[PDB]
Symmetry: C3
Subunit: 333 residues, 3 copies
């Protein structure tokens, strides 16, 4: 395989490494490295801890971006400081359980997998060692996404280009943290020690936390997402295990690929869309008003009470034609 | 803003205020009033009570119907007989969290919001005061829908008009009523007193009741929905917090907008469709047979056991070509 | 009704009785017989038992295949060895609650129903006696599917024929088996005796088991699904009560009708699709690589821990252009 090689420097979510949309490049071998990290992390503002397992230290793992026809060559590294075997499975790839059957590595090992990007869209990747370990590693944080763009960039299905000014990757994670008898969340010394209690809870199918970017409030405050009025923003949303229903409060999905695959035309003008568990989707919106927006799953219990809220802070001029407060709060006549 | 003004007299669901489909009118300011009512109501045939909070005294709130390009001017009134602050957020609107950030009113106050109807479809509206109050006010009943029609009326995506003979609005509500130790549903003296137990249950994500039009059996008996053979009926279905899967037992969705947005062509000939939590959808069906139909969510446990069943009573002539009992029940030979 | 009559010999899932895709036949009366069987069965590898109720002795019931415009004439038989009344409701049919209102039969009785196949797609059929019995009979196993093909066969929505080389029917069943105080699954002497405990659990909405073809591991080992590289396989997936998110691990959905209705064009290149509870869908894939694939619902807890995994064993030549292990596991440098 004698194609040019291009290295990518991955960046932590919700940011995305620099890439072209439409390109005049032909197929390349695009080289990525992912290093697995098992670590105890804090997941909420009360200080609840969690035995996480991650690609590159983040939940979600970083977004990888290539074009249709590229070959994706991933070096997966499992350092000796980890305790368990791991692998990687790409929903974008064809064969060998997505790559999982060719990438099982013990602590202290690495492996190199190449796959051809023959299908366009956004796709989940995740660890999948085998058996009951599969859901456990996924819900512990071992999932991310890849985006495979058409070489001509995105289009609206009617012959018009859609170009985004920026892209963000929102990875949603369902977490299962057991409680003790008095009702406090339990802490564990190792992923192995968390396993028995965690599996019992997992099989009851109700998460304790549903978070974006690994923690309650991760995409708020100094880390709110940003835009300006007039900017077209692409939001890639993934959920490797459980359904989600994204919604931009105060906005819309102007162009939405809820099943996430660019060979299908987008739907237009959505209020709320649906990300099937085990998939990624994408939505584009051109901001028309300044101020704060919330990006949520629109099970509002999960959004407000279990962690699944991000903010956008948008700069620009208020449009009174679109919306105006005609009369401020006042006493009823 | 010097456009003509038109007042609308809202009607209680499942009925919808009179409106045009295709229209020769240009944009207008369409004026609506919603008055919030907190009240204890009965939700099932066993006499279980519930601390409801409503727009205009109903669950769901009434359907508001306008055309693309209209300006919707809503007077929201929070009488002094209520106990909590409230607001309103329209998924159809652009900016200020859908209007929520401009409409927070204490008991004794009112506010007037105007928004331009730039996106067509059916959309949820709901209360959203802030923080954990958001899911609580929604699942207590503070949600409804708005329909924004194209000025040319509905079409099938192939150049043909779809015209409905009647429209019904089915609002589905997930309710969370706690139980006492012996397993009976609890009653509370105020919404505030219901809050702690209700929030604990809400975060476990399993409703005690799933109802149409506010109560088990609301859309049955004297209040069954009606049609005649030959009539094209539009059913608007909303769910502000939790997914639903509508199904017309004995019929179909001839033309369905499950994501609810009229800039997309409908799908045809569905058995069951899907309403994402936080959205409204719409389905049209031309009745071909008389008799009783059930309209359900097709999680049949929720339909039969938790409350989510409506009936249609349809008049007309039976069509033996479509279906016939060839041999009535008889002893096996 | 003076049309030719054709008998069909039904076969047990996941296989499908022989049929034509495109046909030069005109409408016929196609005759099917279903015999209800109530029986205690084993549902997992630990030996948990379950009070099943079935059409033709299987979960799911067999797939019935006809063409648009055919008349489907079903003889439903309820032998005297059963204990309860039963009926059948077809989502493909028009009127009388899908046929349910014309087919209620006591043990010892049979009935004959005919319906015209006016809508194309895959559709659920299920028992629906009345009231709380409806969900109970469905989740006890009394559901299957019918496929109504266009007379010209399937197409891609762009004028090209899709022809499948083989079709499999995967019926997914959510099961509710109660536990005793010490946490073991309970066994019951009759469906009637299982009813009270089972209904209590059902209303909590969380299944104990989620299985394909009636049992954990049913579609594995000697009973894995099979294909060869180059073969186009259609997978029909039904779920009569609860949502599912099918995914072919290591493959894709090349052409997918997730709502299951052939008057709509398929979507292309999906990773995971969505079967609404109360529906059937269909996906086609042309295998490109040999080896083992898993077909799952991509709630991985349900797939790995509650039973919802099937295998495909695929023969043929490995394609190193699509995927290759560049460097086998080795020590980190
Ligand atoms: O981008 C995928 C497809 O989208 C549309 C275009 O008409 C087609 O040429 C293109 O291949
Ligand atoms: O109604 C939305 C659209 O539907 C279709 C028509 O071709 C188009 O003219 C219209 O704007
Ligand atoms: O198969 C359903 C429809 O699919 C497409 C064809 O253009 C149309 O002729 C056919 O009726
Ligand atoms: O945007 C993708 C869509 O656009 C088209 O190429 C042109 O309509 C379709 O063939 C494709 O499904
Ligand atoms: O029904 C709405 C659909 O109808 C069309 O206008 C004509 O096909 C499309 O552009 C639109 O998405
Ligand atoms: O595959 C079904 C689809 O194919 C067409 O006949 C041709 O595009 C459409 O009218 C239909 O919805
Ligand atoms: Cu792992
Ligand atoms: Cu996967
Ligand atoms: Cu409120
Ligand atoms: Cu909302
Ligand atoms: Cu039955
Ligand atoms: Cu049904």
């Amino acid at each position: 395989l004698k194609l040019p090689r291009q290295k990518v420097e991955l960046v932590a979510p919700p940011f995305v490494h620099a890439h072209e949309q439409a390109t005049k490049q032909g197929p390349k071998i695009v080289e990525f490295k992912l290093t697995i990290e098992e670590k105890k992390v804090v997941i909420d503002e009360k200080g609840t801890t969690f035995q996480a397992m991650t690609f590159n230290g983040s939940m979600p793992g970083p977004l990888m971006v290539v074009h249709e026809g590229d070959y994706v060559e991933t070096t997966l590294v499992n350092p000796a400081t980890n305790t368990m075997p791991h692998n990687i499975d790409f929903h974008s790839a064809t064969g060998a359980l997505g790559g999982g059957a060719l990438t099982l590595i013990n602590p202290g090992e690495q492996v190199v997998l190449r796959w051809k990007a023959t299908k366009t869209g956004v796709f989940v990747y995740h660890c999948a060692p085998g058996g009951p370990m599969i859901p456990w590693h996924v819900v512990s944080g071992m999932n991310g996404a890849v985006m495979v763009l058409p070489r001509d960039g995105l289009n609206d299905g009617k012959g018009h280009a859609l170009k985004y000014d920026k892209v963000y990757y929102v990875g949603e994670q369902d977490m299962y943290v057991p409680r003790d008898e008095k009702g406090n969340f339990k802490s564990y010394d190792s992923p192995g020690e968390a396993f028995t209690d965690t599996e019992e809870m997992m099989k009851k199918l109700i998460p304790s936390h549903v978070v974006f970017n690994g923690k309650v409030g991760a995409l708020t405050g100094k880390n709110a997402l940003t835009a300006n009025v007039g900017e077209n923003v692409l939001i890639v949303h993934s959920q490797a295990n459980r359904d989600s229903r994204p919604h931009l409060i105060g906005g819309h999905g102007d162009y939405v690929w809820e099943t996430g695959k660019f060979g299908n035309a987008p739907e237009v003008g959505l209020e709320t869309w649906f990300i099937r568990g085990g998939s990624a989707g994408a939505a584009m919106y051109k901001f028309m008003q300044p101020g704060i927006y919330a990006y949520v799953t629109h099970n509002l219990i999960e959004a407000a009470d279990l962690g699944a809220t991000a903010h956008f802070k948008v700069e620009g001029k208020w449009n009174d034609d679109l919306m105006t407060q005609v009369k401020a709060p006042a006493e009823i006549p």
